[PDB]
Nucleic acid binder design. Structure first.
Ligand SMILES: [Mg+2]
Ligand SMILES: [Mg+2]
Ligand SMILES: [Mg+2]
Ligand SMILES: [Mg+2]
Ligand SMILES: [Mg+2]
Ligand SMILES: [Mg+2]
Ligand SMILES: [Mg+2]
Ligand SMILES: [Mg+2]
Ligand SMILES: [Mg+2]
Ligand SMILES: [Mg+2]
Ligand SMILES: [Mg+2]
Ligand SMILES: [Mg+2]
Ligand SMILES: [Mg+2]
Ligand SMILES: [Mg+2]
Ligand SMILES: [Mg+2]
Ligand SMILES: [Mg+2]
Ligand SMILES: [Mg+2]
Ligand SMILES: [Mg+2]
Ligand SMILES: [Mg+2]
Ligand SMILES: [Mg+2]
Ligand SMILES: [Mg+2]
Ligand SMILES: [Mg+2]
Ligand SMILES: [Mg+2]
Ligand SMILES: [Mg+2]
Ligand SMILES: [Mg+2]
Ligand SMILES: [Mg+2]
Ligand SMILES: [Mg+2]
Ligand SMILES: [Mg+2]
Ligand SMILES: [Mg+2]
Ligand SMILES: [Mg+2]
Ligand SMILES: [Mg+2]
Ligand SMILES: [Mg+2]
Ligand SMILES: [Mg+2]
Ligand SMILES: [Mg+2]
Lengths: 92, 93
RNA sequence: UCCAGUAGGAACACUAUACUACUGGAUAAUCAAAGACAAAUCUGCCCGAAGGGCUUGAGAACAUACCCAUUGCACUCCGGGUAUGCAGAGGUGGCAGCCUCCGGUGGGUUAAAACCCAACGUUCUCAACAAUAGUGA
RNA sequence: UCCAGUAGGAACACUAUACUACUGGAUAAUCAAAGACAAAUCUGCCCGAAGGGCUUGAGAACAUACCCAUUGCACUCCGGGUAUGCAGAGGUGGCAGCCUCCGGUGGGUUAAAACCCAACGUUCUCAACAAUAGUGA
């Protein structure tokens, strides 16, 4: 079921953390407010990213019209996060 | 570059069999109009590429526009207009 | 191995020497390029018995490049591997800030420059070395 | 090396030798598994002087899988490597349909099946070989 935070993978792992951050925010901002967007290049967290919207509908609208988007020459795979983010759990 | 019945596509997943590529392409482009034929070769020079021929010029335009970048077989499509008319069309009108 | 130019020459300051680096040269060692400790000595909080490193090395981290793995649901940084790092500087120790210089970017301005604006720049731990001569207080 | 079972034994057809392959066995050579040329002798067009290959090997092409190349404007076809291919068959030459049989795959049906439907299946060139005997027509 829907969730403020969307989970993205299949991301071009060769992209620097900094760039990936701003690039993601750039293409998702048009969908609403973005509290934060977590990105790690660990062995376990690379090629992945968590985007946090302030509204649940924003995430839904983003998951739908952006699914498959050719991000850095790779089709995005957006899903809902299986659990709420800390920023949101400790907010409401 | 001006419109053309036939659209040129490249950056296609070269690992895909000729047969599959054929039907898969027709499957996603049919919604844009009639398709006379769709040429696909796996030569050294023609692989990763495909030519789709519509019966209407507008069909090709509508297809080039709303399909550009489409994640086909895990690869962004690169649709352009064919630089020259196809034989099927030249020998038709 | 020598010679010169330039920078440095490491716990106060200058000079000379040893010596290190860069550049070019062959006893006459060319001519030259090149280059940041210039100015000034800041505010706040904190620690110490005492605040001042243009040395080298060994670890560690970090950054950048490729290579091998990895399709991975997290919210504390954190797989492995080769190569690279030798530009940042002054303001007396640490953190924060502010000022100035240097640098290569990105803007603004110009005919073009200046001039301005902004962000950014390898750090920690350990170990060795920080010499000699002269002068200065 | 022998023995058996099975298939084959290559230019009409049986059969028996030689011989090839698969499977299992040791002179008594086990028991067994396994397996498609069964039915039928089709419709066009074209070629010939005469239409009938379950043989072997090599090469080439092609498919599949992997590896390096390649972002590439075509409309007969096509870069390299590397490993597999030993199942397709009958309907008298070539081509095109069609029919049936094998095979696996996909789909429908059924409680399961049987059985239906569908698309599929290694080709070409060269070289060698297509033997004895018997009975046939
Ligand atoms: Mg982050
Ligand atoms: Mg000097
Ligand atoms: Mg020294
Ligand atoms: Mg030299
Ligand atoms: Mg000085
Ligand atoms: Mg000074
Ligand atoms: Mg100093
Ligand atoms: Mg210093
Ligand atoms: Mg070091
Ligand atoms: Mg998954
Ligand atoms: Mg998990
Ligand atoms: Mg690493
Ligand atoms: Mg190193
Ligand atoms: Mg540096
Ligand atoms: Mg200091
Ligand atoms: Mg101070
Ligand atoms: Mg400071
Ligand atoms: Mg500057
Ligand atoms: Mg102007
Ligand atoms: Mg700075
Ligand atoms: Mg000294
Ligand atoms: Mg026999
Ligand atoms: Mg034989
Ligand atoms: Mg044997
Ligand atoms: Mg028969
Ligand atoms: Mg015969
Ligand atoms: Mg086969
Ligand atoms: Mg025949
Ligand atoms: Mg015939
Ligand atoms: Mg035939
Ligand atoms: Mg069948
Ligand atoms: Mg039938
Ligand atoms: Mg068949
Ligand atoms: Mg014979």
């Amino acid at each position: 079921r829907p969730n403020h935070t969307i989970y993205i993978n299949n991301l071009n792992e060769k992209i620097k953390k900094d760039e990936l951050k701003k690039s993601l925010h750039a293409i998702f901002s048009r969908f609403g407010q973005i509290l934060d967007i977590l990105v790690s290049r660990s062995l376990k967290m690379r090629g992945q990213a968590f985007v946090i919207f302030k509204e649940v509908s924003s995430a839904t609208n983003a998951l739908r019209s952006m699914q498959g988007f050719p991000f850095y020459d790779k089709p995005m795979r957006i899903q809902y996060a299986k659990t709420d983010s800390d920023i949101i759990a400790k907010m409401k």
